[PDB]
């Protein structure tokens, strides 16, 4: 049903990203076969692809010097990613795809083009290697990948344009997704957003080690105000809640933020200085942990349940269990991550007792530190787990089984959470920021199934 000229000419809308990475995968699965049985092409062009029937979830979508063919395939992949482009052919000086042609960003292909377009016919990747790199979910989705300058390390970030919280003087950096990134004595440990749709203004509030909460708006950084929480290092904000280092938590009314130095509606105390409250999650019942113990809110802002998670030390290491909570995510079961702990436990919100364990290093050693850093929960059933090293873990809450150990192209990972930019991830680590589509694990499963089906068909033929 057509040839790969018309859709590149007129049918630009139907060329979705998952379909874009279905032709090149299928072309390189024929080029690999050709070079396997010692053949050459010398005319690999979009004119010789001749798709069968274009729609993503299809078994077959399109099908057709030795190293001079890989250059032509790289040119074809360039003309696939850039839906257009019609002495410069063999020049090695073509413009970057998104730089001039204005295509949607897509790393690990924008780099594959450069890798396969080198002006030296001896080290460009062979077709087997090019197909091997081409088939990968980390390549297919990876919506964006922004890089940050040296010694701009960060440990807190929030969506909306993305606010980045970064020396010994607290400075915050406004990042826009453009892509040109840009105020307290103490460094900003944690940061979160609140929204007031009634007054069509959004106040962005950051926590500092000196405890001087800041009130600024996203449209301009001029109208600035402060609150009067203080008394410790604010470790978590949520929408307004505050979690300090002494276990105290300060609830805030939505409309109190505009007033200068507004008092909390009611100061709630959990524990002592050795127990910091650093995690707050939305289920209308709040959840969170302090030191080593979990609690629960109600509609009148009072603790209802208070379970002790020190009793988890009967399993795993006491050196990990006897630690502060970093983050909590509340599904039907409770997931909390301990400080410098490669073990994530599963807590039952009903029986108030442990019901399972998740060993991050047990998944990691099948593919580098393993110590959990952040937890992310996605929609119905998909769990995202960080790691102290450079790693990303995907889990399936149905069976707690690994989907794919995504390797972040950085030494470590610090903070990640869901976002709505089209729904995307936001993974940040040492410093690089990577943006992934929410459908990453289902995409991994679908691509693996489709590749298995296609391999079976090719073995049949």
């Amino acid at each position: 049903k057509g040839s790969l000229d018309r859709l590149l000419q007129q049918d630009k809308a139907s060329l979705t990203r998952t379909l874009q990475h279905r032709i090149a995968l299928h072309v390189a699965d024929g080029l690999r076969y050709l070079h396997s049985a010692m053949i050459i092409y010398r005319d690999l062009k979009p004119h010789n692809v001749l798709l069968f029937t274009l729609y993503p979830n299809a078994a077959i979508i399109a099908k057709i010097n030795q190293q001079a063919d890989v250059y032509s395939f790289g040119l074809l992949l360039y003309d696939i990613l850039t839906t257009g482009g019609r002495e410069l052919e063999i020049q090695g000086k073509l413009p970057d795809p998104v730089k001039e042609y204005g295509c949607a960003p897509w790393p690990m292909v924008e780099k594959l083009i450069k890798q396969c377009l080198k002006e030296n016919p001896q080290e460009r990747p062979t077709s087997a290697q090019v197909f091997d790199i081409l088939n990968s979910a980390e390549l297919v989705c990876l919506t964006r990948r922004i890089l940050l300058p040296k010694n701009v390390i960060v440990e807190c970030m929030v969506a909306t344009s993305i606010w980045l919280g970064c020396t010994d003087r607290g400075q915050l950096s406004f990042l826009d997704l453009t892509e040109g990134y840009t105020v307290a004595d103490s460094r900003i440990l944690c940061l979160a957003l609140v929204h007031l749709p009634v007054e069509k203004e959004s106040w962005i509030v950051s926590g500092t080690q000196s405890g001087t909460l800041l009130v600024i708006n996203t449209e301009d950084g001029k109208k600035r105000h402060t609150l009067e929480k203080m008394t410790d290092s604010v470790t978590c904000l949520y929408c307004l809640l505050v979690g300090t280092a002494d276990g105290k938590l300060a609830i805030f009314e939505d409309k109190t933020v505009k007033l200068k130095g507004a008092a909390p509606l009611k100061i709630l105390n959990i524990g002592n200085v050795s127990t910091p409250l650093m995690c707050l999650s939305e289920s209308n019942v709040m959840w969170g942990g302090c030191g080593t113990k979990i609690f629960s809110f109600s509609n009148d802002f009072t603790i209802q349940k208070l379970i002790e998670t020190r009793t988890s030390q009967l399993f795993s290491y006491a050196a990990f269990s006897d630690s502060n909570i970093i983050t909590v995510v509340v599904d039907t079961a409770l997931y909390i991550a301990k400080q410098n702990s490669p073990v994530v436990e599963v807590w039952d919100k009903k029986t108030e007792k442990l019901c399972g364990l998740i060993d991050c290093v047990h998944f990691l050693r099948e593919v580098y530190s393993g110590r959990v850093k952040t937890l992310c929960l996605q929609k119905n059933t998909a769990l995202w787990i960080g790691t102290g090293g450079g790693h990303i873990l995907l889990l399936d809450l149905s069976t707690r089984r690994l989907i794919r150990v995504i390797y972040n192209f950085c030494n470590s990972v610090r903070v990640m959470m869901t976002a709505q930019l089209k729904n995307v991830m936001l993974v940040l680590g040492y410093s690089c920021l990577t943006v992934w589509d929410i459908n990453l694990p289902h995409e991994v499963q679908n691509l693996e199934k489709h590749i298995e089906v296609r391999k079976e068909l090719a073995e049949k033929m």
Binding site: L314, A318, D359, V361, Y368, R371, G389
Partner: protein, 150 residues
């Protein structure tokens, strides 16, 4: 058997001891490893004499000096370098016992290991020395003695 011993060492066998006549686990926890977390003292005086390995690292990679600087102890370290535990063993994240000591503000431990021949130029893939770990957590007191011994 081995599972019962390694689980009870976490709680503390005291009396039960071990087979008057060094099994691992699927998680790789050895009796000394599980024992040095709870920080008992009978553990390393009734099991080291038996012949339990001074260094039998875990899947995480954890000699029972990393654990002793993790939980925070004095007697366990004082005893375990009597046998001659490797003061320069490295975690799978490249943490030495001195690194973990400086991470948790134990001046006593860094003082103990430094006099026993602990280095200060130990390295990880993050390129951080125990001085960096000490300052990053705000425990400049340990960094002072590390600089003095540097």
């Amino acid at each position: 058997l081995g599972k019962k011993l390694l689980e009870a060492a976490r709680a503390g066998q005291d009396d039960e001891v071990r087979i008057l006549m060094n099994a691992t686990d699927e998680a790789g926890v050895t009796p000394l490893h599980l024992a040095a977390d709870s920080g008992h003292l009978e553990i390393v005086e009734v099991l080291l004499k038996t012949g339990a390995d001074v260094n039998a690292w875990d899947h995480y990679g954890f000699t029972p000096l990393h654990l002793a600087a993790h939980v925070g102890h004095l007697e366990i370290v004082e005893v375990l370098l009597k046998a001659g535990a490797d003061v320069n063993a490295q975690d799978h994240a490249g943490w030495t016992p001195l690194h973990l000591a400086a991470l948790y503000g134990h001046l006593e431990i860094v003082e103990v290991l430094l006099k026993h021949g602990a280095d200060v130029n130990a390295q990880d893939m993050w390129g951080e020395t125990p001085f960096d770990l000490a300052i990053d957590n705000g425990n400049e007191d340990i960094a002072e003695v590390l600089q003095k011994a540097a």
